[PDB]
Design a protein around this ligand. Structure first.
Ligand SMILES: C[S@@+](CC[C@H](N)C(=O)[O-])C[C@H]1O[C@@H](n2cnc3c(N)ncnc32)[C@H](O)[C@@H]1O
Length: 257
């Protein structure tokens, strides 16, 4: 019942294992990218993955010898993941990274990884999230990739919502936040192929997904330097790398010590 405080979790009850079985292939890290997420991580390391959907990244983490805990705010996601890994030794917990971290977990991980999870946030949600990741790692490293600029669907959203003159109703240009459930009829028209998941399932997933903010590189930097994220010590961006396969996707490694 943390789905009361965060109704976005409802969006992922809809999807479950479909995300990595029939979802858009490019919407998860490639083999190479799993490897980049994991560099200099060695057997024995404690690693937290936020997003139980990143099933193959989690599986390379375990194969590498790391002690992996997965966090996700959706019960089905946890359940389908625990099913796919029933033979492996791994901890899977129900948690909302934008909620305040349980004290029993502060500074408990060497690494916190997530792939394009920040894209599932609004700006104030993403600020809270980054704080949570930092809270988890204590003096460890956070590696978080972010997809930059607009999604293909965004381009249909602008177009088909301009012609309709509804664009301002569901898109805020101040920080580039979309409200999908509020484009109404435009959403249906703009939907693009996400692997082999069908239109009814997409539409609903989008509608349940709430608001989402789009980021440019300057936007991710502004987020990381924001007072809310530095409220408990100052943050350091150690590096930022443009990923090979994924779509204009920058991976950011940061910490606060
Ligand atoms: C990893 S992110 C998006 C990128 C894509 N799913 C991937 O694996 O590359 C989506 C996953 O994170 C989870 N998630 C989204 N928002 C969350 C939040 N606020 N707290 C915890 N988990 C969240 C969702 O349940 C979903 O499993």
């Amino acid at each position: 019942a943390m789905t009361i405080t965060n109704s976005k979790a409802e969006a992922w009850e809809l999807i479950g294992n479909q995300f990595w079985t029939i979802g858009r292939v490019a919407a998860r890290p490639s083999d190479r990218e799993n490897d980049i997420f994991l560099e200099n991580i060695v057997p024995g390391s404690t690693v937290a993955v936020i997003g139980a959907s990143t099933r193959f990244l989690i599986e390379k983490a375990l194969e590498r010898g790391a002690s992996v805990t997965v966090f996700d705010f959706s019960q089905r996601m946890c359940d389908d993941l625990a099913e796919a890994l029933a033979d492996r030794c791994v901890t899977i917990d129900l948690l909302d990274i934008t909620a305040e971290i349980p004290k029993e977990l502060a500074g408990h991980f060497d690494f916190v990884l997530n792939d394009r999870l920040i894209n599932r946030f609004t700006t104030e949600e993403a600020r809270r999230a980054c704080l949570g990741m930092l809270s988890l790692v204590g003096s460890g490293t956070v590696r978080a990739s972010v997809k930059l600029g607009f999604y293909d669907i965004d381009l249909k959203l602008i177009e088909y919502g301009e012609q309709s003159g509804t664009l301002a109703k569901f898109f805020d240009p101040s920080d580039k936040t979309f409200h999908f459930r509020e484009a109404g009829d435009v959403l249906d028209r703009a939907l693009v192929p996400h692997g082999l998941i069908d239109k009814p399932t997409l539409l609903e997933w989008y509608r349940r997904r709430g608001k989402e903010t789009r980021f440019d590189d300057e936007d991710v930097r502004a987020l990381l330097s924001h007072d809310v994220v530095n409220a408990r010590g100052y943050v350091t961006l150690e590096k930022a790398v443009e990923l090979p396969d994924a779509p204009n996707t920058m991976l950011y490694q940061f910490s606060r010590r």
